[PDB]
Every structure is written in structure tokens, then in C-alpha cells.
Ligand binder design. Structure first.
Ligand SMILES: CC(C)=CC(=O)SCCNC(=O)CCNC(=O)[C@H](O)C(C)(C)COP(=O)(O)OP(=O)(O)OC[C@@H]1O[C@H](n2cnc3c(N)ncnc32)[C@@H](O)[C@@H]1OP(=O)(O)O
Ligand SMILES: CC(C)=CC(=O)SCCNC(=O)CCNC(=O)[C@H](O)C(C)(C)COP(=O)(O)OP(=O)(O)OC[C@@H]1O[C@H](n2cnc3c(N)ncnc32)[C@@H](O)[C@@H]1OP(=O)(O)O
Ligand SMILES: CC(C)=CC(=O)SCCNC(=O)CCNC(=O)[C@H](O)C(C)(C)COP(=O)(O)OP(=O)(O)OC[C@@H]1O[C@H](n2cnc3c(N)ncnc32)[C@@H](O)[C@@H]1OP(=O)(O)O
Ligand SMILES: O=CCCCC[C@@H]1SC[C@@H]2NC(=O)N[C@@H]21
Ligand SMILES: O=CCCCC[C@@H]1SC[C@@H]2NC(=O)N[C@@H]21
Ligand SMILES: O=CCCCC[C@@H]1SC[C@@H]2NC(=O)N[C@@H]21
Lengths: 82, 91, 541, 541, 520, 56
């Protein structure tokens, strides 16, 4: 626990930070993106949020499109199973 | 302060409602406006035995009658006649 | 044995004297002007706004207050003239809010109601100041606070004067939380659609009452939500009586309409389990021996003439009985004991220029009143402290200061009434607004400023001419006259009572004929809180 | 056994990244601008005024402060930017007054010195507000007050904003008397000619020191005396050191010149018989593990980008040791325990939009800190409260409110630092200026307003267009655009940190590199007063 | 102005409905059973013992209590069923002691009298328990204690049960000394022989009264003329009671109330309808608002948060002019109900209003979604809020009380001033049927882990003992035999019992309430 | 408790266990899902600290 090992063991599926508008999407219907690559940028409040790839696998589908409203904690990028 | 308080009260006479605007004068009298007519009213309640009586003057005319307030009805008993007025019940 | 006979103050004025007639005429004109202006302010925001408000099924704020309080009980409205010509082109009748003290279920409470007809209930800076003053009064006197919330939040223009600072909007929530922590009940009645600022008020209140359809509590309105998130949603769905009562749980009571909400509010107050107890002794109340309307002739409207404050005292005290203290020492100041509506009071009035003897006498009287736990009443007709080389040698500053120190440290209830001029350090000495009196009132003829206009122009002129001569510059005599004439006008405009009451500085202008009633109501309200011990600082001897 | 190893916060930033370089460049430019403006303000009133002041034999106010405090001790100046461009054509460097906290004879004291070079020491409204803020700080922290009185009284123009109201000039004397009554020492050093307002200050002070010739205390100056009565008298005769020390008795000590007066002031502070005692536990102080100057690159100057507040915490805490509380619940808010200069502190920082979970977590942490009597530190980077139909259904307003009540009712020392945006009710939730933090500071890149400029224009536009459509009026699309563009500019101008500090809204802007030192000094000063018990209101569960 | 017209709670039940008739019949049978059992208990220790006691010239304990209290004043006896079938073959009517609250010389006092007819006044463990509970009640409410003493001392068999532990006899003396220190008066009348070392009970008392011949503190003549232990000498029982009344008068005590008071008004509906409304079957559900409407002054109730968490009912009312905050159960507890209860408790504590709990709880809602939303967190806040409250608290169990719901609604462990149960109540950790399923599943799974096989028939056989045992423990007479739940009360007398209890509890001043951390 | 520490996998806080939940309402749920360190730390918020094992 001192070496921060438990800090690494944390993972979760992509989700919308809050309810707001999706300004643009960096992930197409089928694309290969490494983890950390931006998927979409969302502006629900005064700030702006960029979504990073939770995993390096190819994106299966894009649930939302630009100008759409995304509910809180809702999936945006579907990742193909590996 | 610097204003005269006017109270809007509704009294049901028979089957028709009546709206009265009462103004609380500084001298203690009341000015009631019913429809387009105004009346200057003053009086007090004095109890004889177990019966409460209302002595009042309306536009300079004074009269006395026994006053009974039971449930939502007001009973005014006098030699000239008896009057029943119903206070509207809030919904 | 309380029946020993006692001499009574006051004398019968000469009605036939021309001076009395002129003073009466001037005071009557001033009072008529005040009454007509108050009527226009009471008219409300406007005809179209009132029509829309009635069409939405809601009650007008004054009707709400009338139905809320006990039948026939007097209502003490505060700061009716707030915002009077304060802004250049915008009219804000009453500051957009209504505040006062009335009796609800036999309990004296402070009522704050938003006037939705004025700018849709938006909060101007004067509105925030008025609400803060009302909250401070309630906290000091330990009065329950009732909020009739119907507002559109802070006025978006002029946001800098409403949002950021300490005495800005957040102080409202701060005071609400503090008073709730101190067992002073907070009750919020959401009688209409609130906003982000309005929404927090019901949340912090101990008990909430929300109307079924008109009441809507949303932390951000539909337009605000769209501007932020963009989530289109109806007002009722985002915030509504049914939602808040059933799912959100913010609402504590559900009301069908305005009358039902007021009835529910009366019930909550009944359940407060509060009993008022008095510390001061009480005696049967007796009316003064002279009519109050003679004050018009006695005082008049000209500040140059001087009138004996003993007449004013004799026309506002119970039975016109007054026990003067140190009558022949420092006679420019009048102090003594009397009773108003059975309440003991210590009266401190001005009869001329303040001197060292007057300051010492006032300090002694204030110490006595604080020791005996007696409320203090200040009558201000001050025009200054005598100043001169000999007066400075005596220590007029020192003497003046020690009065001021005592007044500040006093913990007894303090009520200040300005019946005439109030200038310079005399305002501070006689319990000015800066020294936290429980209430402050002014008569229509009062003038308040740092100094008289003529004196101020002379002081500026001497400094500029002397400064120019030392600099080697030349100051023209005509230039000095040109600077002085505007100064006299500026001081007159600022001194006018209406200008002072437009800012929240005064709890309100009052007709002199109603002074006794206003003082009685104020003292009855202020006696709710217990009287604490008084601790004094160093007295500079 | 206090030696078990504990993990340390913070990480090494990537210096080579272009984002770091750009942020560092922007922050360096902002800090250089701030430093140059502070230098110009420190220059003083002007060259001619400074020359005259030196020719009269007096010391410049900054020299007075330097000689008064202990040798080498740091000085924490407050509100250096007060009055910066506040008035259209008049320049008031520093507001005309100097306030700060320094150590005199081993005791932390609040020092208030008038700058005679600025308008002859006349009191502008901002000067009164600054002095009142300093007095309030001293009263809250129980710090002795030292006044270096050299003033010409209230500015005769703009008298309405300085004399009448509660927070106007009289509040100075009120606070002086109250703090004297509460055993907080008041010391007045009359270093120059005072006036009617200035004269009262030495009178109310417990101890006075007046210079032999420069010092002159008169309740009314020679010009004022002539205006009021016409009496001609020299300044020294009317008020002077010899007169006040001998015949008058107002002066308590007689000083030959400025240096002698400062030496006497130091001696008087020594004789205070005061010892500082701490309630909180203490531990040896350790420096943070990372350089402070990296904060420039980490934070930058663009509010759109987001940075982890944990970096800021790691660069300002002792040893970069942080114990996070509820790390995975409401992760947009960061709370935990740390120590600054050995003082325990509870840190509450913003990492994103506030939600219900964040509000509940903050309320829990505040309750814990109040129970354990631990000082609280707030880092504000708030952008507002989450708004939405689902959020309203949950009770986001309810959740937000409980935080507001918890923050308001807290009695522990509280310090707020605004490192980024502060808008809406988020400002109130995170211990805004209205909730009485002991100190408040902002970084040069902060922006404070009711809402972002673009959002505000949209909210006004929707109301006007919808209102017009309901009225049957027509609102042109071009008119809506014309209204919105000015709004973005107005919000930007008001939000700028310099505008906020011109008003006393904040205690002053601080270089991010000095945040640790400023916080340490502030907490050391605030620990003088004992920590009282905390009483909470109803928590709306 | 207190004249505003207010709506009244309650509705007229349908007398003709068969359900009402059946419920009324069952409740009437239960009440008749309770009355007959109470009569038999009141009979006393026995005929021969009573004859001997009368032959010695002494008065029976109930006669002593009747003569001690003011004429006609009601007497609130406590724990009449203590020791009912508690021991296998020994009968201990009333636990061997009599405790109650009555008015002596216009002052409410707690009276503890030993019944010499039961085992010669020896102290059974239940007796010690009863006496400790009475002393605790008196200390909490600041009531003077009067100890008529006729004790034979500790029962020598069962000595371990009555002598060593803190909750054993020693505490009786400790409480007496502490009450004296706090100025709560302690008065002891030795109306009977103290053969054992019970001499300490009068010695620690502030004032003693000893009868001339019956009372031995070892000789009455020694103790009265030489030992001086005696502060008063009485010729017989009547003289001793008269002296006790005089001693109480000279206490120099005046009762003062903190809460506001209003004129008392009777409820708008008869109390006997509660029999039909509630019945005796716990499976059926009844609206607690009826019970509230039949026991409050004028049937006036101000509901708080009516539509939020409707399974719990909260509001303000007045009983005999005393303000009260009523918290009743109308169903399963949920998160909203817990939050609403916490809010109401905070309000009542802030306003210094006594609290009344009506328990009909069946447990806390359990489920994965409920666990996700912190039912555990919420249930706890309600429980803490209840524990930290300092206002007087009275709990009445009108139905089932199981699981953590008992703790949440001011159970016996949370120190209510008084606790009562109706004859149809049931109390236990969980329903008997539910408990049977839980044990069988754990054993079957444990066998599967070890490779053992659990027979289906064996699991069902294991369940049958659990079902029968749970019912016997839940019976009200089982809980009343132990000193838990004070005594059982007829539902028709609920209003009178609550009024007496609140009047007694209002003697002590109401202190400020300090709350712990609220786990928001 | 003022402060809670729950182990990642061994620690499980449920107001009613799986067998108890089934007995009361006949609902089937795993022990970790009904009550677990991750759930209590992240969604229910009952847990105040998250620990990997006993030593942590
Ligand atoms: C606390 C913190 C920390 C933050 C906040 O609080 S941020 C709050 C943001 N506010 C809102 O989000 C409310 C937006 N209003 C509305 O949603 C409605 O309007 C209502 C609810 C107000 C009801 O009013 P309504 O709609 O029934 O009538 P209307 O005539 O339209 O009412 C008057 C018209 O409002 C215009 N108007 C001007 N200034 C404002 C203002 N500040 N707020 C509202 N309205 C304003 C006025 O100029 C015009 O009339 P005029 O001047 O043209 O004659
Ligand atoms: C509390 C209550 C209840 C009441 C009061 O307090 S009522 C107080 C009345 N004040 C006095 O009675 C002091 C009158 N001053 C003087 O007696 C002197 O002046 C001194 C003492 C100030 C020393 O100053 P000094 O004489 O050594 O130099 P000077 O350059 O002349 O100093 C600057 C010049 O003063 C002009 N100036 C503008 N406004 C004021 C102002 N308000 N007070 C003083 N001076 C002012 C400035 O405009 C010009 O310079 P500028 O702006 O033209 O460049
Ligand atoms: C506090 C500390 C720290 C220590 C102590 O306190 S150590 C106390 C030691 N006790 C004595 O020293 C008193 C010894 N009694 C006697 O001196 C008398 O008896 C009296 C005074 C009790 C009057 O009673 P009595 O004499 O008038 O009538 P009796 O019928 O005889 O009364 C019933 C009969 O007493 C039997 N019996 C059974 N158990 C006891 C018991 N524990 N105490 C007394 N009697 C008991 C009962 O079984 C039988 O009747 P039964 O059950 O056979 O039908
Ligand atoms: O009303 C006129 C005031 C006279 C101005 C004199 C100034 S004001 C404050 C101070 N007190 C005095 O008597 N003189 C000065
Ligand atoms: O900084 C931008 C504010 C975002 C809008 C949020 C609104 S504005 C006022 C109100 N108070 C809040 O905290 N949120 C809403
Ligand atoms: O009355 C039946 C009890 C069923 C629910 C209660 C179960 S058993 C005890 C435990 N405590 C609770 O809070 N719920 C469970």
C-alpha cells in the first residue's frame, strides 16, 4: 500500500461526466484508439471536459453525436469485445 | 404607518355572496364599502347576564341586538327582525 | 404605596401665536406630502404587473401580509421609502420587498415578503440591504422570521453590487443559518416561482410551505438550465410542489393556494412552543396629558429656531410624568426617567450645543441606565460639539468621547429618533446608525449631514486659498464663490429625509403624531430578547 | 511512536510539454504585472507630497511601519490594491491607508497607518471600508490594534458614502470601544495633525502617544473653528503635544519625534502582560517535497483547462503529506487532513462541478473538523452547482444548502483562497466572503462573478424574447445579439482580480509562489484567539 | 389569537363491518384475560401469609399505599406482571415488590413497598430489577423516593443472581446516595422487621420512620432510644403514614413547568373503538392516524412532511395541554422515512418538546437497491438522533417490534422515560418464520462446503423448534415477566396513562441536546 | 462510527445478509453486490476509507 500499488487497481467503463452538450467527437464508428486518446469533448457547465479512452481496443460504436444532450453517467463510446 | 388598513371580507347572505371592504379608522370607527355605498359603523359588545348584546350605530343610526355566533352562521336577534348570515368555509 | 402625587411635564402652547400657526402649516404640508408619497409607493409595481399577478391566481403581497397576521393587529412596516429615486430611471417601489413586524398567533414575528410585481421580484442592491437590515433586527430581538419567497433572483445587471461582498446576497443565507442555530425559528413560504438565489432560502428554512402550482423551487430555472447544461425542461417538472413534496423532499407542507399556505403558516407558529417573558418591571399604561398634534406647531419645519425638547417628551410619555436627572448641570442635554406603555425608559434629548458638562452628564446617565437594565431612548436635535481653544484645553474631545464610548458599550435596548438636525460627531454621540440602535426613525423635517452646507463650503474654500498661496499659485475670489454655491445645494439634497430613507439608513420616516405608538411597538418588539450585562472599556478620566 | 512511514502526495510535472511552457509563460506575465503595479502603488501619493512630508520632519508611513515592527520580522500587508482605479480621475494609492499584521515586542499586532501624502490623509469611502475590515480582523483574532493617526478627516466631497450609514466612519469608534471593552488593547500614536474625525481616535484609545510639534489634536481645526464660530486660533495653541500632555490631559505620552514615538510604542506593547497560548497540537515543520514555482506551469492562466487540485495541495503542505477523506465518493471535491508549519488543517478543494455527493461529503468533513477543533482551508475553483431535472429531483439544492449551513455555522478558524473561478452558489458553499472567513486571498488569474459572461447574456436574451412574444411585441434577433456582446465585456471587466481587490472584496492578491508563507502567517495570526464550540442548526436530512 | 379553526383528525369506523366485530371480540378477550390475571396478582402472596401478616397487626402493602397517597388521587403502578411464571415452580406475585407514582401532599413521588407475604419479603433477582428500574425512573424525573420497608433480605438460594454484579442489590444503595446528593429526597419507613442487613436502607435515607414494635432496624426500642438511627417514632402503620405525609410536606419543593400549556380538551372519538380498529391480528394493517386521533386533545394533529416517506407519521399535538411530538409507524421503514424521522427529532429537540413513539414496526427494508442507497446509513442516522435526544421520551408498542426498527423507534435500550405495550404486541429479533429459513440455509451451505449432505426433512425439523420458541418469547406476558416494557396497559386507558406519565416526567427541567456527527 | 475503514474484498456491509434478504423478501443477491468495499466507497458512501487488506 505504501508503493501506491492499490492506486493502480482502478478501472471503469466510459461514461458521461454530467448532463450537457457534446461539442465534437474524436472517435468514428470503427477506429483503433489507444487508452487516453480523446473520444469526445463535452460542455455541460462553464467548464469543458475531454473524454479519454478507457482502453486501447477499437471503438464498436458512437452513441451520441454533436449537438446532442448526454445524460449523466451514460455510455458514449462502445468498445468492441477483445 | 402612513396608510389606512382595508380588510376584504366575504359574507354569504342567503344564496348570494357579498363582498365588504372594511377600513380601520384611527378614531376607532369603521368605514364599510358595500357595492357603491359606504357606511360609517361604530359600536361595542356588552354582556347582560349570559347574553351578549351588540350596540352599534350605522351612518348615525344606533340599534341594539343580541349577537350569537354559532358554527359558521351569525345570528342577530332584534325586535325589528332576525338576521342569519353565513361565514364562508375555506376549501 | 405607589400613589404619591408627582408633578407632570409640559405646558399648553399658545395657539393664537403666529409662530405656532406657521409651524403647524409647514409640518402639515410635510406630513401630507409624506402620506401621498407613501400611498403612491403602496400602489405597487404597476397596473399591468398587478393584473398579470392577479391573473396567475396569486395574492398581492400586502394582501398576503394582511391575511397572515392576527385580525386587527397593527403592522409596523420598515423602510417604506427604500429605493425612492435611488436609481436614475428605474422605479423600485418599496425596494421590491416588504418587511415589518406583526403578531402571528400571538407571537411577534418579522415578515419579509418579495413583491413580484417589481421587476419580477429581482433583487436590487437596496433590496438586499433592506432584507439584511430586517434579518439583523430579527436576530437582535430574537424574533421568528417568516419569508414569503417570490423572487427572480439577483438582478443580472448591477450584479457586482449584489453578489460578491460580505454584506451582499450570501449574508442572507449566513444570517438564516446563524439564527436557526440560535433557536430563532425560520419559516419559508414559497408562494411563487423562485430561482437559484430564491431556491436556497426554503432549503435553509426549518419549515417550508409550497403552493401546489404557483410554487416552484428549482436551483436553476429552465432558461438558466438551458444556458448551462442545455437540458430543456418544463418549470413544473424541474421544480414543483408535488415533486418537492413527494420525491425531492425539500417541501415540508403542501398548500392548495395562498390562503391555505397562510393558514398553514399560522399553524406552524402556534406549534413553536414559545412564551414571551419580560425582565423589566411593568406599570399600568396612561395616556399623555397633551394632544400629540400640537407637536406640529411646537416643532415646525425650520431648523434655525429652537424648541424645548421637554414639550416633545411631555407629549409622548405615560401621564406626562418625567423625573429629570441633573437638571441644572449641562442644561443643553436633557436626561431623565419615564414610562411608555408601562415600560421604563431612559430619555436622552438634545436642547442645544454639546459641551463638556453635557457629555459628562450623559455618560453618568448611560452608566446608571446600563446598571439598572433600563431601555434607552435618544432624541437627536444635535448641531455639534462646542469647539474652541478653551474648549480644547478643557478636553471637549475627551469629554465627548467618553459619552460615545459608553453609548457603544451599552447593552440595553437602544432606540434613536432624529427630530431635527444631526451633524458631526454629535450623531455618533447620540446613538447614531453606526452604533447599532435597535430601531432608528426620523421626522419629516430632519436633516442629516457631516456639517451644515454653508460651513462645509467655507472649510473647503479656506484650504484651497491657503494651499494656493503657499504653493505660489493664485486663487481667484470669484472661483471661491463658484465652489461654495454648489456645496450648499449638494448638502441640502443629501440631507433631505427622503434621500436618507432611500438608502436603508433609516427604518423609516414617521408622522410625529404617531411617535408614541411607533415607540411603544418598537419597545414591545425589542423586549423579547433578555437584557445582558454591560461591560465598559476604559473610561478616560 | 510517531515514525511510521506515510505516502506523500504530488508528482513531478513534465517540463518539456508545451502546455506547461505556455501556462508558465502566462502566469509569469501575470505575476510580473502584479509586481510592477504593487511597486507603483508603494511609491506613494506623489513626489511633491512626499517632499513636503519629509520637509515637515515626519517619517513616511512605510518607514514608520518598518521601524515599529521587530527587526527582520515579516510584514503581512492587506488590501494593497484598494482604490485601484476605483474613482474616475482621482488616484488613491493603497486606499490612502496602510494595514497589516506584524510582530511588535514579540506580539502579533494589527497596524493601521494613514498615508498623509494621499489627499492630506482624507478618508475616502474605500479607506473607511479598509480600516473597518482591518478592525474586524483584529477583533476576530484578538490582536492588539495600533493606529498611526495622521489624517485630515472625512473627504468633504462624497460625504454621503463616508458619514451616515452603519458601516461608515462611526463604526470605527464603535469597534474601538467594543474591542477595548473586550480586553483587546488599543494604542493610538498621533504622528501628525488630526481633525474632528481624527481627534476622537486618540481619545478612545487606551494609551496615546503624541509627537511634540507635528502632533496636534483638535476636535475642530482652525479653519473649521472659524467656519463654525469665527474664532481665530493657531493650530498648536488649539491642539498641541504640550497642551494635551499638560493642561488638557488627553495625551498619555510625550514624544520628541517619530523615532521616539515608535520606541515608546514598542515599550507600551511590552507592558501589555500578554502571553500567546495555543489550543491545537503542534508538530515539527517540514518543507514540501516539490518546488512552489511549478504552480505557474501547473495552473496557467486559462480557466477553461482543468488541473488537479492535489498538485496545489502537495506543493503547499508540510512534507507533501495528505490524508484524503472519502476519496472515491464525490470525487469532484477533495477533502483531507494535513499540516502547515506544524498546524493541523482541514483542506477542502474543488476539482470539478459540485454534485449531491460532493455536498454531502463536504458537510461530513466540516462536521468532523468542527468536532475536532481543526482550522479549515478552502481552495475555490468552483464553476457553479449542477443543474438539471434529475438533479433537482434528487435535491441538489437541498444538498447544496446543507453545505452552506454547515460552513456558516462553523466556529473554527477558516481561510479561503480563490485559485480559479468562483461563480454562483458555489462561492457561498466554499466559504465565500459573505460567510466571514478569517482571511480571503485570490491568485492573479482568478475570476469572480454571479455567472460566466456568455451564460448571463443567454439568460437575459431568453427572458426578453419570451416576454416579448407573450406580450404580443416582436423582439428582433439582431437586438438579442446587440445586448449579448456588451454583457460578455461587462462580466469580464468585473471579474478581473484587480477590480475585485479595488473594492475591499478581498484581503489582497498574492503570488502563487508565496501561498505557503501567506497561509502560514495567516494561521499563526488567527491562532491567537481560542477556538469556541460550534453549534449547528437543523440539518435538512 | 388562538381561535383559528383547525381541521381535526380521525373518522367514524364502520361498526357493522364483520372485520370490526372480529377485531373487537379478540381485543375484548385479551383485555378480559389481562384484567383477571391482574386481579389474581393483586390477591397477594397467599391466604395463610396474609392472615399471619394481619395477625401481627401490620397493614397489607396495598392498604399502606392507599393510605399514604392523597385521597382519591390516581396511582400509576409499574410492572404489575414482573415475575409472572418467571421461575419454574415458585410464584412471585408482582415480583414481591410494589412500585408506582402517586401524589403525596400535592407532590408526585415514587413509592417502593415490599410485599412481606411473598417469601417473607426476600429479594428475588426480578425484585432487584424492578426496584432498580423504579429508582432509575425517579432519578431521571427527579421524583422523591419513599421506601416502605418490610424485607427479609436476599433470597439465599439464587444468591449469585442477586448479590455481586453492578445491576445486583448493591446498586440499590448507590442510587439512594446519588439521589440524596442531587437533592432528590430519599425517605424510608421501616413498617416491618428488617431481620437481614437491610438496616442500610433506612440508614442511607435522609429521614427514617420506624414503627414501635413491628419495625426493627436489633431492637426498635434500642434503635429509637439509643442507636438514633431512627429520626421518627411511630406507634403503628397509620401513624407512620401520617408522619410520612408530614415529612413530605416540609420538603420545600415547588414544581415548575418549562413547556407552554393550553386548556385540556377531550378527543372527539370514543377510546373503546380502538379494540375494533386494531384487533389482535398483526398481519392486518391499520392506520396509526386513528390511534392518534383517539388519544390527543380535541383530535387536533398537525402532520409534518405528510407526503414524503408516508410509511412513517410525524406531527405535533397536545395531551392534557402538554405539547407533544408524535412519531408513529405505518409500514416498513425506508430511507425517506428515516430522513423524515431524523428531521422531526431534530426539530423537537430544538424546540424542547416531549416525544412520543408508537411502535408498529416490522423491520428495515432490505434489498440490493436499498443497500445501494444507504438504507443502512439512513437507518442509523435516525437511531443516533433518537439516542442523542434529551427531551422526555415515551415509547408505546401497539404492535410488532422487530429488528433494528425497535432500536430506531426508541426501544428499551435507548432509555425512554416510560415504555408500555398493548396486550397484542409482539417483540423479538425477527419474525419466527423468517428466523427458521435463515438458520436452515446457513447449515445446509456449511455442509455443502465440507462435502456433508443436509437432508431436506432434517432442515424442516430444525425449523419447527425455532417457530414455536419465537412465539413463546414474543408473548407480551413473557416480556413483562422480565422488567422489560414496564407494564401492559388496556388500550382504553392509553390517554390517561400517557397523561400521567408526561405529568410525572415534566418535573425535571429539559436540558440542551448535543448531537454527534450526522453521517450525511 | 465517525470514521470507517473497509477492506476491499473481505469487508462487506449489508443491513441484511443474502440469506436474511431471501427470508424477508425472497430476493437473491450476491454478498459482494449487496454489500462490498467498492460499492460502499463509491455509490452508497457509507465507507470512509478503502483498504486493500488487513495490514493496509
Ligand atoms: C442567487 C445567485 C447566487 C444567483 C442568481 O440568482 S442568478 C438569477 C437569474 N435569474 C433568473 O433566472 C430569473 C429569470 N426570470 C424568469 O424566469 C421570470 O421572468 C420570473 C421568474 C422573474 C417571473 O417573471 P415573469 O416571467 O412572470 O414576468 P416578467 O415580466 O418577464 O418579469 C419581469 C421581467 O424580468 C426582467 N428581469 C430583469 N432582471 C431580471 C432578473 N435578475 N431576474 C429575472 N428577471 C429579470 C425584467 O426586466 C422584465 O420586465 P421588464 O423590466 O422588461 O418590464
Ligand atoms: C469625523 C467627522 C464626523 C467629521 C470630519 O472629519 S470633518 C473634517 C474636515 N476636514 C478638515 O478640517 C481638514 C482640513 N485640512 C487641513 O487643514 C490640512 O490641509 C491637512 C490637515 C489635511 C494637512 O494637509 P496640508 O494642509 O499639509 O496639505 P494639502 O496639500 O492642503 O493637503 C491636501 C489638500 O487637502 C484637500 N482636501 C480635500 N478634501 C479634504 C478633506 N476632507 N480634508 C482635508 N483636506 C482635504 C486636497 O484636495 C488638497 O490637495 P489637492 O487635492 O488640491 O492636491
Ligand atoms: C443485603 C446483603 C448484602 C445480605 C443479606 O441480606 S443476607 C439476608 C439473610 N436473611 C435473613 O436473615 C432473613 C431471615 N428471615 C427471617 O428471620 C424471617 O422469616 C423474616 C424476617 C423474613 C420474616 O418472615 P417470618 O419469619 O415472619 O415468616 P416466614 O413464613 O418464615 O417467612 C417466609 C419464610 O422465609 C423463607 N426464606 C427463604 N429465603 C429467605 C430469605 N432470603 N430471607 C428470609 N427468609 C427466607 C421462606 O422460604 C419461608 O417460607 P416458605 O417459603 O417455607 O413458605
Ligand atoms: O452642524 C454643524 C456641524 C458643525 C461642523 C463642525 C464639525 S462637525 C464634527 C465636529 N464637531 C464639531 O463641533 N465640530 C466639528
Ligand atoms: O460559473 C457558471 C455558473 C453556471 C450556472 C450555474 C447557475 S448560475 C447561479 C446558480 N448557482 C449555482 O451555483 N449554479 C446556478
Ligand atoms: O419482523 C421481521 C424482521 C424482518 C426484517 C428485519 C431483519 S431481521 C433483523 C434485521 N434488522 C433489520 O434492520 N432488518 C433485519
Amino acid at each position: 500500500y505504501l508503493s501506491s500499488v492499490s492506486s493502480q487497481e482502478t478501472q471503469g467503463g466510459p461514461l458521461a461526466p454530467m448532463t450537457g452538450t457534446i461539442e465534437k467527437v474524436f472517435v468514428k464508428a470503427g477506429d483503433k484508439v489507444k487508452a487516453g486518446d480523446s473520444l469526445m469533448v463535452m460542455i455541460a457547465m462553464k467548464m469543458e471536459h475531454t473524454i479519454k479512452s478507457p482502453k486501447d481496443g477499437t471503438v464498436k460504436k458512437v452513441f451520441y453525436r454533436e449537438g446532442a444532450q448526454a445524460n449523466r453517467h451514460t455510455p458514449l463510446v462502445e468498445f468492441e469485445e477483445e | 404607518l402612513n396608510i389606512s388598513y382595508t380588510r376584504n371580507m366575504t359574507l354569504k347572505d342567503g344564496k348570494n355572496n357579498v363582498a365588504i371592504a372594511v377600513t380601520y379608522n384611527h378614531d376607532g370607527s369603521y368605514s364599510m364599502q358595500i357595492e357603491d355605498k359606504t357606511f360609517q359603523v361604530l359600536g361595542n359588545l356588552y354582556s347582560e347576564g349570559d347574553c351578549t348584546y351588540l350596540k352599534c350605530s350605522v351612518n348615525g343610526v344606533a340599534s341594539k341586538a343580541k349577537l350569537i355566533i354559532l358554527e359558521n352562521t351569525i345570528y342577530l336577534f332584534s325586535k325589528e327582525g332576525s338576521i342569519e348570515i353565513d361565514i364562508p368555509v375555506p376549501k | 404605596y405607589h400613589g404619591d402625587s408627582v408633578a407632570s411635564l409640559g405646558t399648553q402652547p399658545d395657539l393664537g401665536s403666529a409662530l405656532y400657526q406657521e409651524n403647524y402649516k409647514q409640518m402639515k404640508a410635510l406630513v401630507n406630502q409624506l402620506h401621498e408619497r407613501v400611498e403612491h409607493i403602496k400602489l405597487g409595481g404597476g397596473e399591468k404587473a398587478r393584473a398579470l399577478h392577479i391573473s396567475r391566481g396569486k395574492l398581492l403581497p400586502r394582501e398576503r401580509i394582511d391575511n397572515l397576521i392576527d385580525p386587527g393587529s397593527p403592522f409596523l412596516e420598515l423602510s417604506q421609502f427604500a429605493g425612492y429615486q435611488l436609481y436614475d430611471n428605474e422605479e423600485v417601489p418599496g425596494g421590491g420587498i416588504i418587511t415589518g413586524i406583526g403578531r402571528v398567533s400571538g407571537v411577534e414575528c418579522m415578515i419579509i415578503a418579495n413583491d413580484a410585481t417589481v421587476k419580477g421580484g429581482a433583487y436590487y442592491p437596496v433590496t438586499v440591504k433592506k432584507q439584511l437590515r430586517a434579518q439583523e433586527i430579527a436576530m437582535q430581538n430574537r424574533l421568528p422570521c417568516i419569508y414569503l419567497v417570490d423572487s427572480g433572483g439577483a438582478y443580472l445587471p448591477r450584479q457586482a453590487d449584489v453578489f460578491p461582498d460580505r454584506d451582499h446576497f450570501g449574508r442572507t443565507f449566513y444570517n438564516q443559518a446563524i439564527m436557526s442555530s440560535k433557536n430563532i425559528a425560520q419559516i419559508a413560504v414559497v408562494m411563487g416561482s423562485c430561482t437559484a438565489g430564491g431556491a436556497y432560502v426554503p432549503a435553509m428554512a426549518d419549515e417550508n410551505i409550497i403552493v401546489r402550482k404557483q410554487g416552484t423551487i428549482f436551483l436553476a430555472g429552465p432558461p438558466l438550465v438551458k444556458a448551462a447544461t442545455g437540458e430543456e425542461v418544463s418549470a413544473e417538472d424541474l421544480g414543483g410542489a408535488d415533486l418537492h413534496c413527494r420525491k425531492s423532499g425539500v417541501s415540508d407542507h403542501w398548500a392548495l393556494d395562498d390562503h391555505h399556505a397562510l393558514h398553514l403558516t399560522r399553524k406552524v407558529v402556534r406549534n413553536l412552543n414559545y412564551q414571551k417573558k419580560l425582565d423589566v418591571t411593568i406599570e399600568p399604561s396612561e395616556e399623555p396629558l397633551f394632544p400629540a398634534d400640537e407637536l406640529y406647531g411646537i416643532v415646525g419645519a425650520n431648523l434655525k429656531r429652537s424648541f424645548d425638547v421637554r414639550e416633545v417628551i411631555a407629549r409622548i410619555v405615560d401621564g406626562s410624568r418625567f423625573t429629570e436627572f441633573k437638571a441644572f448641570y449641562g442644561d443643553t442635554l436633557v436626561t431623565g426617567f419615564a414610562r411608555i406603555f408601562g415600560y421604563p425608559v431612559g430619555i436622552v434629548g438634545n436642547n442645544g450645543v454639546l459641551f463638556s458638562e453635557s457629555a459628562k452628564k450623559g455618560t453618568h446617565f448611560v452608566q446608571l441606565c446600563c446598571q439598572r437594565n433600563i431601555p434607552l431612548l435618544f432624541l437627536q436635535n444635535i448641531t455639534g460639539f462646542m469647539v474652541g481653544r478653551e474648549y480644547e484645553a478643557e478636553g471637549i474631545a475627551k469629554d465627548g468621547a467618553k459619552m460615545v464610548a459608553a453609548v457603544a458599550c451599552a447593552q440595553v435596548p437602544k432606540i434613536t429618533l432624529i427630530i431635527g438636525g444631526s451633524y458631526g460627531a454629535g450623531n455618533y454621540g447620540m446613538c447614531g446608525r453606526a452604533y447599532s440602535p435597535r430601531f432608528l426613525y426620523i421626522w419629516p423635517n430632519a436633516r442629516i449631514s457631516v456639517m451644515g452646507g454653508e460651513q462645509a463650503a467655507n472649510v473647503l474654500a479656506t484650504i484651497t486659498k491657503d494651499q494656493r498661496a503657499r504653493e505660489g499659485k493664485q486663487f481667484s475670489s470669484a472661483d471661491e464663490a463658484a465652489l461654495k454655491e454648489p456645496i450648499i445645494k449638494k448638502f441640502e439634497e443629501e440631507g433631505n429625509p427622503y434621500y436618507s430613507s432611500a438608502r436603508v439608513w433609516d427604518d423609516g420616516i414617521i408622522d410625529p403624531a404617531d411617535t408614541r405608538l411607533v415607540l411603544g411597538l418598537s419597545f414591545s418588539a425589542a423586549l423579547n430578547a433578555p437584557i445582558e450585562k454591560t461591560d465598559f472599556g476604559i473610561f478616560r478620566m
